[PDB]
Design a protein around this ligand. Structure first.
Ligand code: HEM
Ligand code: HEM
Ligand code: 8EY
Ligand code: 8EY
Ligand code: 8EY
Ligand code: H4B
Ligand code: H4B
Ligand code: ZN
Lengths: 413, 409
């Protein structure tokens, strides 16, 4: 593995040199003979597995605070060791928890928003014991992060995994999302992405309003127990109705979206410890709602209706009526959020910020893992600076990881 | 092992076995993915095994693997390598090899067409004049009055490296670009360096916005010579818009025939350093990349002004709006002039169909997502949600260094 790897930006001719990749921990899935960079994803750690994972992390932490090789570093290593020796696990100090969380985000190769990585409110919920307790923590998270539209990024971290049979999980994939319902005629009402989860909620007791934008209940599992239902107080759920600055008819589609993107099904991995419930949130890039959430065929799929109202020729694809429609929808989204003073970033701004962030990281850190397939926005790719930017992808730790859906593993009590 | 790729829109799962035949490197490792790097990473001793592998698959493709003819061919090639340090492809092999180079081009969304490829054998060429004759014939055949037909012209293979045939142009047809004293760029900024080389070599530039470059042709390692393609062979399309009558006043145009002339074709260990190949355009190639790149024509501003868009904030999406109109214009103009062109929706759709065909009849299809996904409206095309496996099969087209960094005059 070569000490230096060069990436080039093909628009600016800027060449950057990556050394950070030498700290790569896990595999990517790619080999010498195959690249899997477009694959979406390519009981517990034993004592002997745990030791070097923890030491690697503790060393990295003390190196970060410029106390590497210090008495404090050496003592902490010893304390972590004895703890793993007598309990087969260990507890992170608060400082270490906060550092690990920030760094999992800093290391998230698919995240274009990482320039903000060091500004992350970390909520320590490691004392939580019940789903009601989880509910309380999540509400406080939602309220803090929402901040009346002036969104602040944040993460709440619940107790780490122990034996694997006492996991804490948020069964929701996001804290806030809209229900989808399959109708007997095969049609779908609400968000088609959410049909299975909605179905689980209904089975667990949830009475669905059966509308187009029903906010789902939280489905919360504590200490390996059966998950429990809770309704988020509506006044904590900031929403933005979607209208257009030129098209007066746009509001008549009755679209709206929630302001707070809060992903809740991922696993936070720090120094070998596994945090199976660690909901984190930031603010939206417009395209996430306007291209994917609205215009994906497997989603709300409104390109057609907008095109109709725009009186476009929808007979030939080469009229580009879809492309035209896609733009206007994204314009509506950005305008609607800005009008209501709810934080949102357009894809041009986000991508330019990312390029600057990447350059800075190459300078202060020796690199910045980035997944081009995910970094480039789902519309207008080549007119954003990341399109022409060569990137290196690799997995650093701490990191956020996928985990199986809990209904597939849970032992019902 | 066997690998699965999933389409997340249709849930279709395909199984790849073809990658097990891959012999070349991708540039990645278990620890580092280089999928977005543009270019990552003979002798008798190495030559025969490469030749064998190819001859083997050729005879395999015609259901005659291990035939007397197969064995005879292997023996013939061996002796030919012994007594001359190289070997020559049969016409059949040449045609098979070229089609398969296209077939294996992971970055090409147009590969549904791979077996319709007119192969011009130019291996008897000895001079720049010969090359020019061949290239004019290629262009006239491929253009076909607007009904474009894919073609490749293959010049003699490399011998010792000192006698290479090279087409110095990156494409057969391109517009020049000129560095203006006031710092800017007239014409096409992609071609500033090449243009200067042509000027330095005797070319008299008209200094317009759309000057067709001369061919700069190198034969048998000698210095390159200049030729002007007869204009009646160069099909062009004036760009206008079906709604915006002002669009034609921008005075934009483009050439009908995309013909890449700077890559290397490799077959059975042999290297063809001059092998211009051509197809027809996907609209975005012109309308997004050629016109709207910052390091290219960069006319987004101009079009956005004429649309009376607010260009003060990026969040107005004025660039995106202008981008779609430019691409509508490109498609409309070509279609109106009955010049073959494909939109990115139609193209990506066809590619999905092609992948299904390849998985069925070949056990897979190497594909580079980073390149297959179009440079606009990504996720509203079916390829965006389609998992792809990228791997390198041979025969293949490869990058090679620009000749003005290797040549001694
Ligand atoms: C502050 C504003 C933020 C913006 C604008 C932003 C933007 C994005 C976008 C556009 C994506 C791709 C989303 C998709 O296509 O599904 C993404 C992915 C991701 N983000 Fe960020 N994000 C932000 C905050 C955060 C925070 C606070 C964290 C963690 C602490 C985070 C971690 C991640 C991770 C782990 C992924 C990849 C998930 C996967 O592999 O599926 N982001 N982000
Ligand atoms: C017939 C219609 C064709 C269409 C619509 C088409 C389309 C495309 C497009 C859009 C690209 C991406 C290029 C870029 O954005 O820079 C590409 C790449 C490529 N095409 Fe095709 N193509 C066609 C025919 C052909 C033919 C006839 C050949 C060769 C015999 C070919 C070989 C290649 C190769 C080797 C690349 C990638 C070059 C690289 O690795 O940089 N294509 N094609
Ligand atoms: C003795 N210190 C001065 C020194 C001299 C020379 C010389 N001449 C080369 C040096 O490289 C150090 C180094 C360290 C790590 C490396 C890794 C992980 C990978 C890799 N491919 N190369 C590496 C090279 C250092
Ligand atoms: C379902 N699509 C694949 C997918 C799967 C999983 C999993 N498991 C998680 C995914 O998270 C993307 C993400 C995560 C956090 C984000 C934050 C904080 C802000 C923001 N604007 N966008 C974000 C996007 C996406
Ligand atoms: C400059 N950008 C990277 C780049 C480098 C090189 C090299 N060396 C060649 C490139 O050609 C891509 C290509 C090749 C053939 C094509 C054909 C036949 C048809 C078509 N519609 N599009 C095509 C696009 C692009
Ligand atoms: C950095 C990146 O790999 C580079 O800009 C690539 C990305 N995808 C592309 N895709 C196509 N079709 N053509 C290109 O030139 C590029 N450029
Ligand atoms: C098949 C492909 O990897 C998949 O659809 C990816 C492509 N790139 C993406 N990029 C982002 N930001 N989000 C996504 O969901 C996807 N989906
Ligand atoms: Zn890879």
């Amino acid at each position: 593995c070569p000490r230096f790897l060069k990436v080039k930006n093909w628009e600016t001719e800027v060449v950057l040199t990556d050394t950070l990749h030498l700290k790569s921990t896990l595999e990517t899935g790619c080999t010498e003979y195959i690249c899997m960079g477009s694959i979406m994803h390519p009981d517990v750690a034993t004592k002997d597995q745990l030791f070097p994972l923890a030491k690697e992390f503790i060393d990295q932490y003390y190196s970060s605070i410029k106390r590497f090789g210090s008495k404090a570093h050496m003592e902490r290593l010893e304390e972590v060791n004895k703890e793993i020796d007598t309990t087969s696990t260990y507890q992170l100090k608060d400082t270490e928890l906060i550092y690990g969380a920030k760094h999992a985000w800093r290391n998230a190769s698919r995240c274009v928003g990482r320039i903000q990585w060091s500004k992350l409110q970390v909520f320590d919920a490691r004392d939580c014991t019940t789903a009601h307790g989880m509910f309380n923590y999540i509400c406080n998270h939602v309220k803090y992060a929402t901040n009346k539209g002036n969104l602040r990024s944040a993460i709440t971290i619940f107790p780490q995994r122990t034996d694997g049979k006492h996991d804490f999980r948020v069964w929701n994939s996001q804290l806030i999302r809209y229900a989808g319902y399959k109708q007997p005629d095969g049609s779908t009402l609400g968000d088609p992405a959410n049909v299975q989860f909605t179905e689980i909620c209904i089975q667990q007791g949830w009475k669905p309003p059966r509308g187009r934008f029903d906010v789902l209940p939280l489905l919360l599992q504590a200490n390996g127990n059966d998950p429990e239902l809770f309704q988020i107080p509506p006044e904590l759920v900031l929403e933005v109705p979607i209208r257009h600055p030129k098209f007066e008819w746009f509001k008549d589609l009755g679209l709206k979206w929630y302001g707070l993107p809060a992903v809740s099904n991922m696993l936070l991995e720090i120094g070998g410890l596994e945090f199976s419930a660690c909901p984190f949130s930031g603010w939206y890039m417009g395209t996430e709602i306007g291209v994917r959430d609205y215009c994906d065929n497997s989603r709300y799929n409104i390109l057609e209706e907008v095109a109709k109202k725009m009186n476009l020729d929808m007979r030939k694809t080469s009229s580009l009526w879809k492309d035209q429609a896609l733009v206007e929808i994204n314009i509506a989204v950005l305008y609607s959020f800005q009008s209501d003073k709810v934080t949102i970033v357009d894809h041009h701004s986000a991508t330019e910020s990312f390029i600057k962030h990447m350059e800075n990281e190459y300078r202060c850190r020796g690199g910045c893992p980035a997944d081009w397939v995910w970094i480039v926005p789902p519309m207008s790719g080549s007119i954003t600076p990341v399109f022409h930017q060569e990137m290196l992808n690799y997995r650093l730790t701490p990191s956020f990881e996928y985990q199986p859906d809990p209904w597939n593993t849970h032992v019902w009590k």
